[PDB]
Amino acid sequence: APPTLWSRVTKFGSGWGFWVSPTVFITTTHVIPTSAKEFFGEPLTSIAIHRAGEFTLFRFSKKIRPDLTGMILEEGCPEGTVCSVLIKRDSGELLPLAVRMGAIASMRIQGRLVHGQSGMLLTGANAKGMDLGTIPGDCGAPYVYKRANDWVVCGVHAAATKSGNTVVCAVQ
Amino acid sequence: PPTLWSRVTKFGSGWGFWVSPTVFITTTHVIPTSAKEFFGEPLTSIAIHRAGEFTLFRFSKKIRPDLTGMILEEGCPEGTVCSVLIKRDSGELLPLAVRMGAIASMRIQGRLVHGQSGMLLTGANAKGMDLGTIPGDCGAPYVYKRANDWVVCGVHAAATKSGNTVVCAVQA
Ligand SMILES: CS(=O)(=O)NCCc1ccccc1
């Protein structure tokens, strides 16, 4: 995946978030530190929060990341799209996990109720564990895909099943 | 904490894989043709076992004493979904699902390559996103999970321009 997309993935709370533009940051609601009153040097005062279940978007009144260009955020993707989940791991290692996207779904995962766009990992037979699959600390990682010329972001990592094969993308 | 990715190592014009502290496997065509040492050990002290596009090195001391010995087998049953553990010079780790077929001699781009056929589960077109192999990927290992055990069953030897087809070179 392009270096400019990896540059947009920021360590955040118990996971990650993603810079859509110099002013827009998206993440998974449950990774956000519940006590936090300041983000990227800005008071809560100065920030527009948009929360829809496990999807959260932050809009800043200042350019926090002026090195970036604004890219397309969409509300999930067509069923059958193959996406990459941009997961950073121990060592400066970069894991762009391939996922075939399915329907919008409501599930119970480890007792918690989750809603988003479901998908199946294309990494192995059974993706249980950290070599072929996701771990809890990957939540908030972006789902991206390429069109003709364009790259698109369509959601953030919310959950995965015990077997590790099924994932859920939180969407706008 | 141990990872299979730790055992994937840059080597000649491609990659190889540590099976054990003393055992390293790779694809014959990526090995340098001028060398007096590998991994600091004189070539005098290394057993080389070659069978077409599969080569095994056995060193006279532990090069990777941090590792345990893994199961190495001559290919896998047809229908097994393997993962090819691709490392890229970008720093990306790209595990891709491959459905394994028969042993055969296959015409790939110019040439005749003997080993176990497979097809990528990404099988749209696998060139433009991180969804297929490139020439520099040769030597990457084919692995799968069986009961509690990881098995390694060959090394990446060849791929078609693209429809979906790959060849895993195997021990014999
Ligand atoms: C939050 S900060 O004060 O340490 N820096 C602001 C700019 C920035 C934000 C996110 C990622 C990289 C840089």
Instruction: Report how far ligand 1's centroid is from the alpha carbon of A40 (Å).
Output: 5
Q: Which two tokens stand for residue A37?
A: 């009153």
Residue with tokens 């055969």: B104
Q: Which two tokens stand for residue B123?
A: 């099988």
The finding on whether A78 has its CB within 6 A of some atom of ligand 1 is no
* Local structure of A38: helix, strand or coil: strand
Resolution (A): 1.6
Whole-angstrom distance, CA of residue B48 vs CA of residue B58: 7
Q: Which two tokens stand for residue B72?
A: 């190495």
- Would you tell me which residues 128-147 of chain B have a C-beta closer than 8 angstroms to some C-beta of chain A? 128-131, 144-145
Whose CA is closest to atom 7 on ligand 1?
Answer: A64
**Sheet containing A15-19, strands listed edge to edge, beginning at the edge strand earlier in sequence:** A9-12, A15-19, A24-28, A55-60, A47-52
Buried b / exposed e along B65-89 (16+ C-beta atoms within 10 A): eebeebebeebbeeebbbbbbbbee
Q: For residue A140, give the nearest of A56, A61, A67 by alpha carbon.
A: A56
Q: Which two tokens stand for residue A10?
A: 């920021």
Q: What is the DSSP letter of B110?
A: T
Whose CA is closest to atom 5 on ligand 1?
Answer: A40
Beta carbons within 10 angstroms of residue B160's beta carbon: 16
The technique by which this structure was obtained is X-ray
Mutate to test the interface with A, among B70, B81, B93 (most CBs of A within 10 A): B93
Residue with tokens 């010329």: A149
Q: Determine whether the interchain pair B81/A122 forms a contact, defined as Cβ–Cβ distance below 8 Å.
A: no
Q: State which amino acid sits at residue B40.
A: G
The finding on whether A6 has its CB within 6 A of some atom of ligand 1 is no
- Burial class of B105 by CB neighbour count within 10 A (0 to 12, 13 to 18, 19+): exposed
Q: For residue B118, give the nearest of B52, B151, B167 by alpha carbon.
A: B167
Torsion angle, alpha carbons of B100, B103, B105, B108, to 10: 10
Q: State which amino acid sits at residue A110.
A: Q
Alpha helices in chain A (DSSP H): 3-7
- Would you tell me which residues 5-64 of chain A have a C-beta closer than 8 angstroms to some C-beta of chain B? none
